[PDB]
Amino acid sequence: GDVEKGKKIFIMKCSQCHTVEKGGKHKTGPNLHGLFGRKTGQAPGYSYTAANKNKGIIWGEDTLMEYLENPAKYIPGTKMIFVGIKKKEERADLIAYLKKATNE
Ligand code: HEC
Numbered sequence: 001g002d003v004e005k006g007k008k009i010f011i012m013k014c015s016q017c018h019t020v021e022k023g024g025k026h027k028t029g030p031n032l033h034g035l036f037g038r039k040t041g042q043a044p045g046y047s048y049t050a051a052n053k054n055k056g057i058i059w060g061e062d063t064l065m066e067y068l069e070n071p072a073k074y075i076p077g078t079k080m081i082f083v084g085i086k087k088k089e090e091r092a093d094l095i096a097y098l099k100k101a102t103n104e
Contacts, residue, residue, distance in 0.1 A: 009085070022104075039057065040053065
């Protein structure tokens with residue numbers, strides 16, 4: 001994925017509710033640092049829905065590709081109220097950005 005395009009997508013579509021950096025604040029949604037390889041619903045200090053806590057899968061490229069296409073379809077009961085990103089290439093770019101930013 002194209003990390004520079006992904007950053008712009010993150011800013012436009014996600015930053016209102018999320019931070020990615022180490023020690024970043026929680027906002028409407030949880031800080032996303034350390035996301036990859038973690039089970040759903042595990043950011044310290046954030047109050048998740050039971051649905052997000054119980055989904056029970058590991059975040060990675062594939063599971064994010066599916067989640068970000070339609071969040072509430074993947075996690076029914078989620079409080080993340082966001083339509084999703086329809087185009088596969090846009091999801092791949094965003095995910096490439098997340099994979100970098102949430103791990104440095
Ligand atoms: C822009 C496309 C994004 C991306 C990449 C993510 N979000 Fe959100 N998000 C929001 C809230 C309230 C939650 C918690 C939901 C709940 O407890 O039910 C989330 C959760 C996520 C996750 C899961 C994190 C985990 O630790 O399991 C992920 C990967 C994620 N988001 C990515 C709120 C919002 C928004 C507020 C209106 C918006 C916009 C977004 N999220 C957008 C995005």
